Design an enzyme around this catalytic site. Structure first.
Site, PDB file in Angstrom:
ATOM      1  N   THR A   1       8.919 -74.449 -36.368  1.00 36.48           N
ATOM      2  CA  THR A   1       8.878 -75.830 -35.903  1.00 36.48           C
ATOM      3  C   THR A   1      10.193 -76.151 -35.191  1.00 36.48           C
ATOM      4  O   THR A   1      10.959 -75.240 -34.880  1.00 36.48           O
ATOM      5  CB  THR A   1       8.589 -76.814 -37.053  1.00 36.48           C
ATOM      6  OG1 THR A   1       8.507 -78.146 -36.532  1.00 36.48           O
ATOM      7  CG2 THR A   1       9.663 -76.745 -38.127  1.00 36.48           C
TER       8      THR A   1
ATOM      9  N   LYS B   1      11.325 -73.291 -31.684  1.00 32.86           N
ATOM     10  CA  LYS B   1      10.151 -72.796 -30.957  1.00 32.86           C
ATOM     11  C   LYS B   1      10.478 -71.961 -29.721  1.00 32.86           C
ATOM     12  O   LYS B   1       9.819 -70.953 -29.462  1.00 32.86           O
ATOM     13  CB  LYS B   1       9.185 -73.923 -30.589  1.00 32.86           C
ATOM     14  CG  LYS B   1       8.563 -74.620 -31.780  1.00 32.86           C
ATOM     15  CD  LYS B   1       7.568 -75.668 -31.320  1.00 32.86           C
ATOM     16  CE  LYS B   1       6.890 -76.363 -32.484  1.00 32.86           C
ATOM     17  NZ  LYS B   1       5.912 -77.378 -32.006  1.00 32.86           N
TER      18      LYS B   1
ATOM     19  N   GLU C   1      -1.228 -64.897 -24.407  1.00 36.49           N
ATOM     20  CA  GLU C   1      -1.256 -65.583 -23.117  1.00 36.49           C
ATOM     21  C   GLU C   1      -1.032 -67.084 -23.307  1.00 36.49           C
ATOM     22  O   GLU C   1      -0.282 -67.709 -22.553  1.00 36.49           O
ATOM     23  CB  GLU C   1      -2.567 -65.316 -22.376  1.00 36.49           C
ATOM     24  CG  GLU C   1      -2.635 -65.946 -20.984  1.00 36.49           C
ATOM     25  CD  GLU C   1      -1.562 -65.420 -20.033  1.00 36.49           C
ATOM     26  OE1 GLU C   1      -1.440 -65.963 -18.914  1.00 36.49           O
ATOM     27  OE2 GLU C   1      -0.834 -64.473 -20.402  1.00 36.49           O
TER      28      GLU C   1
ATOM     29  N   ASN D   1       5.028 -71.099 -32.170  1.00 31.74           N
ATOM     30  CA  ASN D   1       5.030 -71.767 -33.467  1.00 31.74           C
ATOM     31  C   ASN D   1       4.436 -70.833 -34.522  1.00 31.74           C
ATOM     32  O   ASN D   1       4.301 -71.215 -35.683  1.00 31.74           O
ATOM     33  CB  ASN D   1       4.229 -73.074 -33.458  1.00 31.74           C
ATOM     34  CG  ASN D   1       2.740 -72.857 -33.237  1.00 31.74           C
ATOM     35  OD1 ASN D   1       2.287 -71.740 -32.986  1.00 31.74           O
ATOM     36  ND2 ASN D   1       1.968 -73.934 -33.347  1.00 31.74           N
TER      37      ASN D   1
ATOM     38  N   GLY E   1       6.377 -80.648 -23.125  1.00 33.43           N
ATOM     39  CA  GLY E   1       6.016 -79.462 -23.901  1.00 33.43           C
ATOM     40  C   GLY E   1       4.685 -79.564 -24.626  1.00 33.43           C
ATOM     41  O   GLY E   1       3.938 -78.594 -24.697  1.00 33.43           O
TER      42      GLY E   1
ATOM     43  N   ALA F   1       5.988 -85.161  -9.440  1.00 33.90           N
ATOM     44  CA  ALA F   1       6.612 -83.837  -9.414  1.00 33.90           C
ATOM     45  C   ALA F   1       6.352 -82.979 -10.650  1.00 33.90           C
ATOM     46  O   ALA F   1       5.800 -81.880 -10.553  1.00 33.90           O
ATOM     47  CB  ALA F   1       8.116 -83.982  -9.199  1.00 33.90           C
ATOM     48  N   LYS F   2       6.753 -83.491 -11.808  1.00 38.43           N
ATOM     49  CA  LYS F   2       6.585 -82.782 -13.074  1.00 38.43           C
ATOM     50  C   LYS F   2       5.119 -82.534 -13.445  1.00 38.43           C
ATOM     51  O   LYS F   2       4.812 -81.583 -14.165  1.00 38.43           O
ATOM     52  CB  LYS F   2       7.345 -83.528 -14.180  1.00 38.43           C
ATOM     53  CG  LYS F   2       7.283 -82.900 -15.561  1.00 38.43           C
ATOM     54  CD  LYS F   2       8.149 -83.685 -16.543  1.00 38.43           C
ATOM     55  CE  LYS F   2       8.079 -83.121 -17.959  1.00 38.43           C
ATOM     56  NZ  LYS F   2       8.509 -81.699 -18.039  1.00 38.43           N
TER      57      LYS F   2
END
Ligand code: NDP
EC number: 1.1.1.25
Lengths: 272, 268
Positions: free
Chosen positions: A61, A65, A77, A86, A129, A154-155
């Site tokens: 955790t 990670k 994958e 995790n 994430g 963008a992100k």
């Protein structure tokens, strides 16, 4: 007796021990699972020693990670794309396999709530994430499409590019959104007083299923908001948690346990 | 569900106690907590949230000694606490189970301590924590020896009233004993205490607090002089854990099963 554990810092609010202890008792497995707090920069070393004393696998955790991602010899994958791990597992040959069960945990939770992703239009709110780790598994369910959204276009696009090789994934800024979706999945964080990101309520519909990764007593602020505009079904992320854990249990051992009983138990204590 | 844990900087306790939990069907969870600030803070907070008891590893045993509202006879003498327990009145009890673990391991190995001559090598915290429990077994005498004599003499005078206890430097040791206990760190550095092996006899029982794969360095050395029985500290670890478990749950758990599992992990 095979040894398993959860490494993190802190571990005070970890349900994994309670969770995996019940799965082991339901599926009678010769295993033990414990919570090990580790110093901010001692995960690598703490991990090395663990697999030495007979450690078969373990959950990771915050905030190890990413460090675990590098620590693993080979990554699944889903873990590769996730960029975080995790779940570690020492294989029979010797090496340590890194994996991430966030996505599948979400998918199995959805199915438990009778939500089918096949040919559905999905809206993934957020692109950090948490969002990154759920894409691949969502795509595998073969939906019509998945639209990733963030305040900054963008992100959102970058994330959509990373998984472009597995399905139809679009990207849009919150100000662009102008249509409803069959399934809305929120990965963003809200303030403790309930302030949510500026998203146009057009995204919701009478047939829309809303899934929020956050969880708590009653309904989350995001789900309450979805219900004000039409939401047909609101779900929180508590099932996802029990799900992802259930997936790790299946990975190390080889049998997925019943969450029904455990999820129910975790919720009674949560409501208490 | 009752929360228990072990506080330390770097453990087998979680594994050990979780198994005692299964065996005795005890509804509880045992975790390994980090120690930032300081132990005292982590501890206050721990009991402040519902924790019922915990173990304490070095070097927080002395600070755990101060944290306790009331100590047990054996803890006061040991001068350190490896086990804390919140009583029903909110008070925190501090106890030290290392010595009782050693004694029970010895007795489990069929070693007679009553009326026996014993040599305790070392005068640090590990030695001090096992004196009272050994003295309660009523041995004929306990010889405390240590590299730096002064510290051995000071420890012998500290417990003089509880039994026949005397101190001697290594050079003075020129006789065999019924039971030889090694509580020094020397082994960590791969060294042996500067003691003439005459202390070992074919009737001698050697107990080393250290443990690991195969025989320990100190025990291989004891075997090079025909000792009657060489034992490591794995039983002590499992034993001290069991006493703490009884202190917190009221029931005593079985150590054989667990001790054998840990042994398997050591041997590859
Ligand atoms: N196996 C493992 O991984 C673990 C083992 N343990 C055990 O816990 C115990 C903790 O030790 P503790 O007593 O608290 O430490 P202390 O420093 O308080 O005392 C160590 C004692 O051993 C003596 N000693 C150390 N090195 C040598 C040497 N090379 N030659 C001769 N004498 C020596 C010292 O003598 P002097 O007073 O003259 O300095 C001192 O009295 C250890 O004995 C160890 O076996 C603890 C944790 C982990």
């Amino acid at each position: 007796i095979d040894q398993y554990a959860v490494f993190g810092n802190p571990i005070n609010h970890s349900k994994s021990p309670f969770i995996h202890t019940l799965f082991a008792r339901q599926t009678q497995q010769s295993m033990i699972y414990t919570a090990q707090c580790v110093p901010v920069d001692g995960f690598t070393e703490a991990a090395k020693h663990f697999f030495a004393q007979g450690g078969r696998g373990c959950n990771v955790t915050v905030p190890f990670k990413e460090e675990a991602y590098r620590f693993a010899d080979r990554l699944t994958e889903r873990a590769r794309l996730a960029g975080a791990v995790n779940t570690l597992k020492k294989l029979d040959d010797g090496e340590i396999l890194g994996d991430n069960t966030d996505g599948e945990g979400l998918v199995q939770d959805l199915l438990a709530q009778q939500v089918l992703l096949k040919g559905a239009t999905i809206l993934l709110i957020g692109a950090g994430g948490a969002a990154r780790g759920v894409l691949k598994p969502l795509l595998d369910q073969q939906p019509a499409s998945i639209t990733v959204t963030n305040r900054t276009f963008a992100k959102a696009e970058q994330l959509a590019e990373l998984v472009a090789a597995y399905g139809e994934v679009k990207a849009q800024a919150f100000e662009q959104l102008k249509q409803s979706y069959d399934v809305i999945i929120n990965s963003t964080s809200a303030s403790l007083d309930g302030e949510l990101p500026a998203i146009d309520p057009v995204i919701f519909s009478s047939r829309s299923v809303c899934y929020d990764m956050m969880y708590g007593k009653g309904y989350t602020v995001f789900n309450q908001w979805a219900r004000q505009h039409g939401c047909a079904q609101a779900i929180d992320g508590l099932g996802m948690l029990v799900g992802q854990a259930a997936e790790s249990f299946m990975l190390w051992r080889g049998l997925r346990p019943g969450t029904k009983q455990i999820l129910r138990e975790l919720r009674k204590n949560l409501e208490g």
